[PDB]
Design a protein around this nucleic acid. Structure first.
Lengths: 369, 129
RNA sequence: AAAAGUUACCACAGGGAUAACUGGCUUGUGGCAGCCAAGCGUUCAUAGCGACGUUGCUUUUUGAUCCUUCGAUGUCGGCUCUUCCUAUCAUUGAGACGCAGAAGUCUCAAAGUGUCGGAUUGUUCACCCGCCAAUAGGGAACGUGAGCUGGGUUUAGACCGUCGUGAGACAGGUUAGUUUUACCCUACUGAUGACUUGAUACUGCGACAGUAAUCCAACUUAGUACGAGAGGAACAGUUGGGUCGGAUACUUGGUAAAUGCGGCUAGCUGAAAAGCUAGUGCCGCGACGCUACCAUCCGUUGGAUUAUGACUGAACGCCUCUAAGUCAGAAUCCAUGCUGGAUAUGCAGUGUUAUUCACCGCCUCCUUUGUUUCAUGCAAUGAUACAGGCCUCUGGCCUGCUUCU
RNA sequence: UGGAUUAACGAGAUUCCCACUGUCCCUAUCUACUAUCUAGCGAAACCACAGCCAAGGGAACGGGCUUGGCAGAAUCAGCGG
RNA sequence: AUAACCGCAUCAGGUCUCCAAGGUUAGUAGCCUCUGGUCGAUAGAAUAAGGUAGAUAAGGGAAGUCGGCAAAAUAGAUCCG
RNA sequence: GUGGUAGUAGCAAAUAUUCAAAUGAGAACUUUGAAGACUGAAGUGGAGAAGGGUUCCAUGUGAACAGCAAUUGGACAUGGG
RNA sequence: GUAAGCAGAACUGGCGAUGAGGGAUGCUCCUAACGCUUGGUUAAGGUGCCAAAAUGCUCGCUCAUCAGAUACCAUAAAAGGUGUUGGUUCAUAU
RNA sequence: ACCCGAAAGAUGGUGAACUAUGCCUGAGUAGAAUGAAGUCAGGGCCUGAUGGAGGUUCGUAGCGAUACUGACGUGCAAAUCGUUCGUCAAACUUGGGUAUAGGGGCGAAAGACUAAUCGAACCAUCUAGUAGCUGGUUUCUUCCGAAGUUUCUCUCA
């Protein structure tokens, strides 16, 4: 028999299976296409999620909110500068892409070198020691390969999480593709970055759509209702936080489209999320034209779970996750995108009243020692 | 072309009646521009056109399906300036099949988003919000 | 043989030799689509229709049948949840009109997306009130009871009416009446995990599988086109909303056994102070966390074609979208993007490779054994075409690796 | 085989209204004991043989048969086709 | 008699009688305590889904359902009516 | 007579135990102290009947029994009442 | 009887009591009936591969934006086609 | 009478420790609400006290068991547990003694109850009761090899 009242489906089949992925940072997948035309530039970044706070800006859209002062929720992402290290050629074969030769730098720090060990405290710390004497005796044999062959080139960069207030040190290594012209000049771009900190202002700008990669915050094994968004059964023997009918008799088998109990969160996952402010760790980050009061983008009492005293970027996963950002796959203009941003006021105030801690001291006055 | 506002009244709700048409009550029955969800009670926000019966009022004005517009709302909603308004009481106005109000005077406050849409209800209102 | 009933209080031996469900054959009946052309359609058989006849299809109706099941396949309906079909109600792109516009009716490609809130009834159906782009029809053991529910039907109690002399009967009405077990195998959803031309570490590639967005309204376009007038569009542009999906907790709301701080009742510690017991003793506020259209954000751009309309152009001195050749073209299809990849017992690059008799590599030289789906020359590198090709090119060659080494 | 009424009474059978609510829109959080993990203890129903599907024919709805799709150790938590 | 009885058993079941403290209160109600009695009921660690019992929910208030089923709301005393 | 199922279901009502010392081959579980709880006089208190029949009391202990343990016991053994 | 893998008869042959080879698969169709076996030859039916044997030879027809493909047998009809290949018979090369 | 299998019949005994009812003799049941006759006063039959009736009401113990169609359903339990609910001075609850026994009893009547047994208990015997109906029926080779049709039949398994 047919259904009775034809409702739409619970949940998408687009994302399946719903299982925790094998990766803590977001793997990129699909860099944007090469214009042999632009200069050479990096097309991605890594940063750590912090906390989000609202901001006030003036809309420039005839909407009824034209020329009015809208509050907006905004995530701060801590982004200390990613140090370029290596470079990787890629042959285009009929099977797929294929790595021809990785070249590396002379001198890596212990920040990068922790990634290669699971036990740093025991080991004698040998990684790139035979390579370093080989480098001084450099690699203009192996760079000549990448100029001759190889359609695609990618700089190996890495993070600096000693500068972050996570208790980490270990530092994520990451391929980032280079999209400009001429396969020689991509390598000359990469070569001159070796042992140089790339800042965030090199990559991204104020008023730009960014596609954000990450991993969702975990909830463990959750049931049908929370996991798939399913109707709760009426007030039912056995229980009521579950589907009643899995399946019809035939096929004599449970189909994959029916929703079940299992993992929720820790899924690898967005596109078109506007950058409002690129900042500097080097005072007056949260200060604007309007308010003119001296602030840092740390709120009072820290971001809960703390500080930030690095470069950051605002924009429209869990805390302390490594996000990656991406430059959008086509440069698009939707009026909504390509908007004049104007920030009046950034909030740096449990339930905060005061913007700054000296403002609190003025209110309460001479307190008792 | 109304912006979304939290829906504070389902179809079942019985609300107050502002105007001088003589109705005390308005019992909601349906909403204009409601699509298709299984099991979802159709609900109305501030500002928007509905259908209603009067439950107590003038005897010619009872047992018919009048259109009304909703004018105050006890459910909270977010203005874009970043705070949450909510009124003391739910209330509406009996209205013609066009959209014009029937009885001219309007007691109470009204919302911003009633006066922003409907021109006539703006004029007769005492003080908006 | 010499011979009346009743059993819903029932019992026993058996029966799928034999009824009440599904399934199977059949398709009268039901449902859907063709063929002919008397007339209807002011005029005109065929825009839309179609009598008298006649040919099919379907198994969503109901019969007919008794093949399967009586040492039991749990008999209606609703709720929940998934998928499939197309005989398409809406949405996309067309064609026809008795198509001026608007509104429609008919037909083709179309199943990508969508098909709702309530009153009465156990209902399936039905009939109303309303919304809406539209509220199309169906299948999956008349989907779905170790999923629920138990209103109906179908035990035992009892009431009424009709029938019976009575016990009792009724496809007549009425009320009260138990819904058992998963810990097995598989399936589905999630979790580890041995091993493969070494170990161990990091960055990757992406075969294959799954897929996601979809409808409406307002403002201008415009009181313009069109029309005798009433009425009255559309594309590009701008702004929102619905449904669906994926995240998140700045703010607003919810949660409290951080028993966090305060307040109050009863009892108990000689009192005060401090508390403790009333399984959270109560009331107010209550960070962090988790969380809600009850909150905020976000939801790609390319190719090949369908219907259809055209180009050039014969067969047929002309014509012709077609026969040979092309072109445009969709809510379609395949990519792209997105999810997985212990979905290929798949593949690549790079780091470090056992405290100095102690094992461990790599490259030659030469011996022990043991593996091979398969040693006896188990051999031979232009690139094309076939109504043409190749050159040692004023010549020569092809008609076979049947050759040449 | 009683007909028509009827105050009071009813764990009796129906309908409507006010109050009140998580029954519902629409789900969310919190508590204890469980499930879960360990130490010790430790059953039972059931069991031809076994356990991936599509179609086919067949006693007319196959886990085994024919033709295809395919097929990689060993394990834990759930679930009800 | 939550282990000497009967229920196959040291079984959350059943089985006649007497005596009967303080505070709160109408009260042998419920709640806390003194005398007398007991800590007998396998433990430790984690705090998933799903359960069992127990709480609470903005706006609406039966639109859920065969049906207000379950849960809320009301509650004592005095005076008026 | 013996398997698979399986070291699986499960041992989760009656608010609750903790610290030390002694005994012992061995202590989450025996005894003694110190704390903390419960029962809350129509009591899980003090006495009888029916029914039971030595379970009463002491000393001792290798098994089995007391669904974990056990130095404990309504168990086992020898006495007494 | 509308019909049925429906019910009831007549003649012969089968299945039941019966394998073997063929019809992919089938109690009833085809060939053909069986002691253990070596060699030879056929039957039904087949010869691109699965699969033993023909990518054999020779002459026609067919292009399907759902071709067709082997009795019982696993369905198709009325009515159409200036798609193509032949035929029959009239009328001026059509 | 090849082996195993009924629903039943009859003969002779054993049970009222559970339950049904009668009899004899004992025991039991807070605290509130309502305020009947009777009586006393004052006013001209009214007003106020007094009084303490009822198969009266709220509600403990005790007797019972409506709902959740809750928990449990290889249970703690062959009827239990939780919250809710009925009645509570009477046609009430209850111990002991005593009476009634199987086509008999007892029944405020449901075919209820009569030792987890009831539209006729239990125990033994007649009894290995009967069955045109199910299910089984134990070594090998060798040779021959069926029928499902006729007539009659309380005959159509």
């Amino acid at each position: 028999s047919h259904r009775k009242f034809e409702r739409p489906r619970h949940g998408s089949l687009g994302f399946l299976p719903r299982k925790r992925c094998k990766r803590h940072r977001g793997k990129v997948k699909a860099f944007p296409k090469d214009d042999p035309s632009k200069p050479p530039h990096l097309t991605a970044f890594m940063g750590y999620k912090a906390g989000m706070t609202h901001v006030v800006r003036e809309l420039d859209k005839g909407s009824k909110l034209h020329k009015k002062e809208i509050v907006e929720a905004v995530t701060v992402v801590d982004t200390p500068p990613m140090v370029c290290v290596g470079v990787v050629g890629y042959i285009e074969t009929p099977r797929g892409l294929r790595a021809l030769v990785t070249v590396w730098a002379g001198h890596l720090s212990d920040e990068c070198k922790r990634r290669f060990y699971k036990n740093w405290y025991k080991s004698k710390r040998k990684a790139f020691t035979k390579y370093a004497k080989r480098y001084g005796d450099k690699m203009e044999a192996e760079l000549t390969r990448m100029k001759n062959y190889c359609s695609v080139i990618r700089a190996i960069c890495h993070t600096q999480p000693s500068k972050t207030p996570i208790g980490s040190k270990k530092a994520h290594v990451m391929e980032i593709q280079v999209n400009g012209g001429s396969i020689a000049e991509k390598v000359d771009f990469c070569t001159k970055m070796f042992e140089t900190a790339v800042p965030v202002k090199a990559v991204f700008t104020e008023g730009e759509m960014i596609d954000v990669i990450g991993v969702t915050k975990g909830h463990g094994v959750k049931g049908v209702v929370s996991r798939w968004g399913v109707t709760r059964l009426p007030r039912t023997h056995r229980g009521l936080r579950k589907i009643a009918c899995i399946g019809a008799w035939h096929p004599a088998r449970v189909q994959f489209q029916v929703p079940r109990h299992g993992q929720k969160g820790y899924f690898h996952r967005e596109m078109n999320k506007k950058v409002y402010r690129v900042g500097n760790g080097a005072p007056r980050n949260a200060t604007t034209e309007s308010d003119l009061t001296e602030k840092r983008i740390t709120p009072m009492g820290g971001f809960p779970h703390g500080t930030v005293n690095n470069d950051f970027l605002l924009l429209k996963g869990c805390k302390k996750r490594p996000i990656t950002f991406r430059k959008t796959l086509v440069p698009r203009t939707t009026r909504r995108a390509l908007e004049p941003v104007n920030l009046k006021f950034i909030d740096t105030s449990g339930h905060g009243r005061f913007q700054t801690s000296e403002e609190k001291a003025k209110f309460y006055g001479p307190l008792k020692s | 072309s109304k912006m979304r506002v939290t829906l504070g009244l389902p179809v079942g709700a019985l609300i107050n009646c502002c105007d001088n048409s003589g109705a005390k009550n308005l019992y909601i029955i349906a909403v204009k521009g409601w699509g298709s969800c299984l099991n979802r009670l159709p609900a109305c926000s501030l500002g928007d056109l509905v259908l209603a019966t009067v439950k107590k009022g003038k005897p010619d004005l009872r047992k018919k399906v009048h259109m009304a517009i909703i004018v105050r709302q006890r459910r909270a909603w977010r203005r874009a300036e970043g705070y949450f308004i909510y009124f003391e009481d739910n209330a509406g106005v009996v209205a013609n099949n066009k959209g014009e109000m029937k009885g001219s005077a309007v007691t109470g406050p009204v919302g911003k988003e009633c006066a922003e849409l409907w021109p006539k209800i703006s004029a007769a209102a005492t003080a908006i919000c």
